[PDB]
């Protein structure tokens, strides 16, 4: 394939599931791994251990493109905002930027009704 050097990480931690996706700099998603696919279902995958083993599955997924640099764009609230990039430090690609790309509307579309 095309063994590129730099990658970007996308950590879409939400309130139930945590998805890690190594893309390139340009935008094509190279590899991905989910905390729901990494060996859990239902109650377990809203814990940051599930996020860190999702990042380990993703390290398996792109330990062959020659990724030697990796900036991380975390998104959303929930479990795996911090322990996911802890696991990416364990995986060992270099981290330059740790940016937060959480979509905050400036009072835009109406959120749903409050769960009793």
């Amino acid at each position: 394939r095309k063994q590129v050097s730099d990658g970007v990480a996308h950590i879409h931690a939400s309130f139930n599931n945590t998805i890690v996706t190594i893309t390139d700099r340009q935008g094509n998603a190279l590899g991905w791994a989910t905390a729901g696919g990494s060996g859990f279902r239902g109650s377990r995958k809203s814990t940051p251990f599930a996020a860190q083993v999702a990042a380990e599955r993703c390290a398996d997924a792109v330990k062959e493109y020659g990724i030697k640099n990796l900036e991380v764009m975390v998104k959303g609230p929930g479990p795996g905002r911090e322990s996911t990039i802890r696991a990416l430090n364990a995986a060992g690609f270099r981290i330059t930027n740790i940016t937060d790309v959480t979509p905050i509307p400036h009072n835009g579309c109406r959120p749903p009704k409050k769960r009793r």
Partner: protein
């Protein structure tokens, strides 16, 4: 909150700096506040109750510490 790494700064320190920066810039707090639609009467009423408790503690600590208790 784009946060670079600087040289001779280990990643535990860089992640702590990102943590405290995102926390004080208010991403978690604002997603938890904009998850569900807090109806405008509950907005005004929660604000009034927060103002009541804020003024009440900031007055009542003097109104309780003006004496001895031991």
């Amino acid at each position: 909150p784009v946060i670079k790494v600087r040289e001779n700064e280990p990643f535990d320190v860089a992640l702590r700096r990102f943590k405290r920066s995102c926390e004080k810039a208010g991403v978690l707090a604002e997603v938890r506040r904009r998850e569900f639609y807090e109806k405008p009467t509950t907005e005004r009423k929660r604000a009034k109750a927060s103002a009541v408790k804020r003024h009440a503690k900031k007055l009542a600590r003097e109104n309780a510490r003006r004496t001895r208790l031991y």
